[PDB]
Symmetry: C2
Subunit: 802 residues, 2 copies
């Protein structure tokens, strides 16, 4: 247990804590300005001149003094209540507030021993901010205390709420930009309080950093009427409190006492909510939220060159852009830095005085040191059930190509038992698609958690105020909740219709970048569980829907995060249920990855045994010798290669037909796509030798690919024999139609694959046969048109091994 969760003070905040909070705010403002502006002389020792100012002034002043003020008060809170706390910095461009926090709390020097607590350390701390060889502009993963960089705005609330799930002792003050609040993802993030339980989960305190402005405009929320603003948050299930400061001549000490008293009223209400939830965990309470209204750039010069700067969008970037070049800007900078009175905050040796930090939390309650903000320190391996009990044994008993299994159902049973064995640290998310993607065997041991109104057992099924499945019709919520759940040391999976995974492409990009920086240069940030995404209900079999639901292209986005041997991205095609089981065990064991797991949910053949899936998954691509009819590679007339359940089914039917014509070929299945890249681009890929063995040194290769052919073509560009690959992929053809028609219009159906194989072998010799196959595809189509179902010869085909 960290600290003493949810305890009220029952006395006023002491005047000593108020004095320490004002010193914190002044020292973090001073050091934030130092980080932005100063390359040397951090204490302004004589002579302090323009030569000490950075040659390239980059940064974001405006948000920062508001964050520094909140962080003083959140530190004071944590210390007085001993409260287990992780904050979210929505405006992650306020990086200096986050580095200054860690430097003040001591974690920065503990993690970065060269940045010492004295004048030499402080000089280095100032220069290194946003500087070549130094540290990023934003609250990056290399900053102690960060689980959210806040570079691409909008995910503050999904991350805050995902962090408190199954984390009942954890308090998350979530600082949200008022511009950020204009984004789609942030706007829906407010509603997460209908999806957490106040007994079994922790508590988020949203703090709207209502500083009036974004970069070059006011914000929507700052300029609507106060009555609209309050109705808005009340309508979303909060009790809104509002603090206003900095717009008049109120002295800073008074402002701190008034905020502290407010923040104690807010926390007391949170503690009341927490105590009440021990007895009534079914009534959803109105959680406090804080509207925090202060001037953007607070404490910087009010006017610069006749332009209003404090209390304006003009405070957003770097005030005094000429500070190095003109004595006029330099004099203003010097007076600004002096207004914090650093001679009271730093000892002569340049260490921050003890009376600045006596009010601060200590040990693991510190914001930089809490293990929830470095969740791999808390993470434990899942207690996984034995895989073999889930195997589809139909392949062993009856043959390769057996049955009509809906593949994700085996993964559902496996997830069900993972939740059973790990009852509060593995969650499932779905955007109203858990049952649709066939993972609902999980409801046998848990419920979808819903903390909002109930009506009737006639309609509410598998739903309770507490449970380990979460659904909301928002891919952004599912992805954001899951990410923070991983970042605080837990585990899980979500599922999406494949075309809609694109809604969160940009979130996958940011989490891949978090992983990239981490695996490369932050070894103190320990490994977290991987994002596991079941990409299902795919392009080939969106039977109730149509062309809007046909876009397998997240493959292509993911290929853009496969560099430097980071190995943070995996693209897997689950050929069948036994392959899916093998991939899933692997993904549930992995760490520091995004794993995109493609599987169809339609009734489909099972191709491999579980033991075979395990070996094949390891290699990445494998010959299926029981399906090949060639003796060796020299005999092979064409390589039949596929990735995806549907391309594989169609290739296999083509192979059966090609066999019967006396054509010689081998069958290669591809599961782990990026293992096709060269060793030069991927040091864990197939060697050229293994690749050549699979795909031959010079026979034609027909490659039936689940997604866009572009992907495979770009990936094998420097491989031996790549000029002989013919890649067939999805090509933006399709509608609401039968399963044969969908493969037909993309040249993916078995008859077109048989034709393409013939064309690659001898176009002249097989001209007639190619024609007959093309004519058969027309006939099968006319049959679907006239009759309303696909031709039996198509649908009724079973691989001859069965």
């Amino acid at each position: 247990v960290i600290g003493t969760p949810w305890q009220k003070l029952d006395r006023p905040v002491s005047e000593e804590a108020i004095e320490g909070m004002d010193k914190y705010w002044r020292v973090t403002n001073y050091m934030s300005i130092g980080q932005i502006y100063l390359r040397s002389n951090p204490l302004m020792k004589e002579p302090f001149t323009r030569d000490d100012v950075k040659h390239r002034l980059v940064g974001h002043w405006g948000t920062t003094p508001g964050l520094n003020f909140l962080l003083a008060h959140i530190n004071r809170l944590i210390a007085d209540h001993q409260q287990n706390t992780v904050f979210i910095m929505g405006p992650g461009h306020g990086g200096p507030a986050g580095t200054s926090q860690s430097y003040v709390d001591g974690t920065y020097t503990e993690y970065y021993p060269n940045i010492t607590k004295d004048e030499a350390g402080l000089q280095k701390f100032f220069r290194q901010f946003s500087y070549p060889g130094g540290i990023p502009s934003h609250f990056a993963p290399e900053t102690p205390g960060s689980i959210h960089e806040g570079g691409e705005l909008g995910y503050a609330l999904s991350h805050a709420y995902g962090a408190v799930m199954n984390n009942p002792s954890l308090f998350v003050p979530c600082i949200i930009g008022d511009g950020e609040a204009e984004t789609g993802p942030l706007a829906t993030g407010w509603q997460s309080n209908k999806l957490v339980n106040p007994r079994t989960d922790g508590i988020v305190l949203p703090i709207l950093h209502l500083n009036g402005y974004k970069i070059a405009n006011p914000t929507i929320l700052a300029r609507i009427s106060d009555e609209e603003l309050h109705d808005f948050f009340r309508g979303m299930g909060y009790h809104p409190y509002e603090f206003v400061a900095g717009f008049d001549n109120e002295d800073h000490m008074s402002i701190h006492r008034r905020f502290a008293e407010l923040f104690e009223t807010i926390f007391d209400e949170i503690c009341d909510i927490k105590a009440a939830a021990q007895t009534d965990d079914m009534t959803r309470p109105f959680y406090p939220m804080l509207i925090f209204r202060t001037p953007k750039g607070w404490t910087c010069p009010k006017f610069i060159d006749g332009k209003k700067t404090e209390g304006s969008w003009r405070a957003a970037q770097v005030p005094l852009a000429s500070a190095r070049d003109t004595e006029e800007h330099f004099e203003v900078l010097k007076g600004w830095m002096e207004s914090y009175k650093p001679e009271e905050l730093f000892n002569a040796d340049g260490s921050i005085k003890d009376d600045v930090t006596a009010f601060m939390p200590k040990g693991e309650l510190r914001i930089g040191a809490n293990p929830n903000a470095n969740g791999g320190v808390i993470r434990e391996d899942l207690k996984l059930p034995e895989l073999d009990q889930y195997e589809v044994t139909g392949v062993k008993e009856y043959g390769h190509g057996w049955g009509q299994v809906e593949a994700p159902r085996a993964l559902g049973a496996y997830c069900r038992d993972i939740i059973k064995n790990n009852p509060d640290s593995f969650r499932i998310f779905g955007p109203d698609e858990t049952a649709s993607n066939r993972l609902n065997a999980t409801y046998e041991v848990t419920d979808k958690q819903w903390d909002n109104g109930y009506l009737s057992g006639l309609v509410d099924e598998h739903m309770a105020v507490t449970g380990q499945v979460t659904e909301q019709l928002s891919e952004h919520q599912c992805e954001g909740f899951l990410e923070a759940y991983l970042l605080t040391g837990r585990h899980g999976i979500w599922s999406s219709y494949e075309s809609f995974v694109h809604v969160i492409d940009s979130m996958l990009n940011q989490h891949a970048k978090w992983l990239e920086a981490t695996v490369r240069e932050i070894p103190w940030r320990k490994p977290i569980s991987s994002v596991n995404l079941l990409v299902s209900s795919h392009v080939w079999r969106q039977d109730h829907n149509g062309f809007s639901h046909q876009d397998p292209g997240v493959t292509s986005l993911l290929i853009n995060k496969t560099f430097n041997n980071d190995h943070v991205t995996n693209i897997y095609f689950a050929t069948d249920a036994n392959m899916l089981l093998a991939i899933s065990e692997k993904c549930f064991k992995s760490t520091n990855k995004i794993n995109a797991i493609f599987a169809g949910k339609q009734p489909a053949p099972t191709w491999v045994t579980l033991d075979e899936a395990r070996a094949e998954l390891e290699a990445g691509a494998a010959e299926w010798k029981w399906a090949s009819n060639a003796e060796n590679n020299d005999e092979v007339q064409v390589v039949l290669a596929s990735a995806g359940d549907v391309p594989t089914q169609e290739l296999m039917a083509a192979s059966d037909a090609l066999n019967k014509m006396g054509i010689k070929f081998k069958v290669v299945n591809v599961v782990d796509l990026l293992k096709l890249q060269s060793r030069e681009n991927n040091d864990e890929a197939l060697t050229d030798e293994e690749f050549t063995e699979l795909f031959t040194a010079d026979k034609p290769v027909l490659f039936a690919y689940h997604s866009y052919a572009q992907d495979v073509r770009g990936l094998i560009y420097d491989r031996p024999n790549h000029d002989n690959f013919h890649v067939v992929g999805y090509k933006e053809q399709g509608s609401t139609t039968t399963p044969f028609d969908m493969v037909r219009v993309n040249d993916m159906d078995r008859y077109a694959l048989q034709a393409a194989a013939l064309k690659l072998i001898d176009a002249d010799k097989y001209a007639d046969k190619i024609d007959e196959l093309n004519a058969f595809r027309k006939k099968a189509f006319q049959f679907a048109v006239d009759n309303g179902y696909d031709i039996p010869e198509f649908t009724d085909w079973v691989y001859p091994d069965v």
Copy 2:
């Protein structure tokens, strides 16, 4: 002018209109069920049997009878008030409500003459829904009345609001799913009413289709308390009205009279708002919104097999899935269809009776016929200013590589004059980045439109209640507003930081698919203006930000919409301002496209004259002979090829160095990326002959690419000489650092490009030189570290022609 906008009735709705609305609702429910279930015998003539039921039952019943009820009332409204109206179907899976609407209003037969108004037409109309060779499941662009397919949920409100911008006579009832309302984009879409003006823009009426459920869960908005629901919409600036029907035994006629009276109160308030705005266009009014609460699946059987179906998520997909296979499901279907009493709705010849449609609007006020729902019918070409006045003439007067121009500034001046010449039909959108991406010359002739509180001229600049620039910190809003603005026949552009364009990848996918279907098979849907997206503040020069802001990968997404010779997607790299001007003229003239226009905003050299940009843009890729030093292709030791402003600058510096070493090469610039693909994949690309002429038959090609190298490698896979291309792209390296460091860490800087060129020519011979260049890159880096700015030799370099 269409109809008589914003007129009140001043009498009750007649009892004849109520009777016609009930017949409409019954006939559209009946035909929607017919579309889903029936392959033949649409009037249930003797014998009506299971053999008439579709073999594959696919569709979405639950939303549909709610949409049919609203559409009866919206038709009645349009007719009585003669109101210019386009509706949005958020739940686009309710396609049968939209096809039934068009069939009832007459447009379906006018556009589709084979689907006639009689028993044979009706049989064909039923069978073709969601059927091979037939029509889509959703409200697709081939349906008269659609500007929004609603397949990927969330964009209903940005589309509704973009449609009414500069459209003051237009009324848009926007039907929003209550599951859809859980998405990010929909949640922020509510706030658009702070960004429209009630005098100069039209009016959106959001109608929340609060049917209690999404696919397999209740919805958040249906289960919060009524007081939260109302506070929520009031807090977002609406006057909420709520209608509740269908949960008790109230007869249908009474329900219609009560709704009609409500809908007239709502419309009267909209007409009052419209009249008031003629005098006070500065006070933002509280626009009505309608909470419409009815049972999902309304009018279907209450229980099926002991399970509650009407008023449940179980109504979502296809009730009675066994209707063809069991007499039990068939009998239930038969009684359901009979409950609408079709013998009262259809004449003996199977035409819909005149008394079903006497209340309907006629002519161009019909929902299927309004030209705002087919905006290419209204669209006019922009009055474009002459391009030559914007040219950067520094290249002509001083030489290739001249100056420090911020390229988007020339596009800003051009946009300024486009707005001047087309003052109410060209808009700019930006996610708080218009000034940051340098398009702010537009503010010289217009303002950012902001209909929310003002404070002071000290902070509000270039902002007014009416204007043709719109900003909100939401890429989803900018993209959605713009799309509907184009779809209703107008024009514009938006700009985004390049890495954040990914936020709307999935919207680009849906609009590309809309374009695909349209160019292929909907010739009555006339061409609309193109989406023009200035992709700027790119990966190489995000000076105040860092790694989160480095992702040029929307190139890769866009490559996935380049099929079938649809030609709906363009990727352009603006080499400099004169190239940007030429690309922009082209894009502003184009139709039916998404145009992604890459340009850097940093101070940068201008390479080509405007006349040269015009010729080069047409070819797609061009040799720069004034920069090449080889005589002919046989002399060429390496092809220096680049795409993007920064890769080009670095390649050009490498060329200057390579020249001075006596290396022979040619320089090729690439602007129109997809023109690199083969003719087989792109019938407007460079021929093999032109390609070979640019890139040689067999010399090595060094290709410096702005984005991920994967893209170029996949694109040129079947081109002559592609095995000799070495593609250098962004490789997920970078942080907050100097401009040299950013190109350095991706091997993109001039010294690494010079080295790579040497390595391709003779690795052994140039081993030492390659070493010295590698060592110089280390030195330049150490210099940035020690000094705080890049080495003068790097920054001060100007191409020798200047």
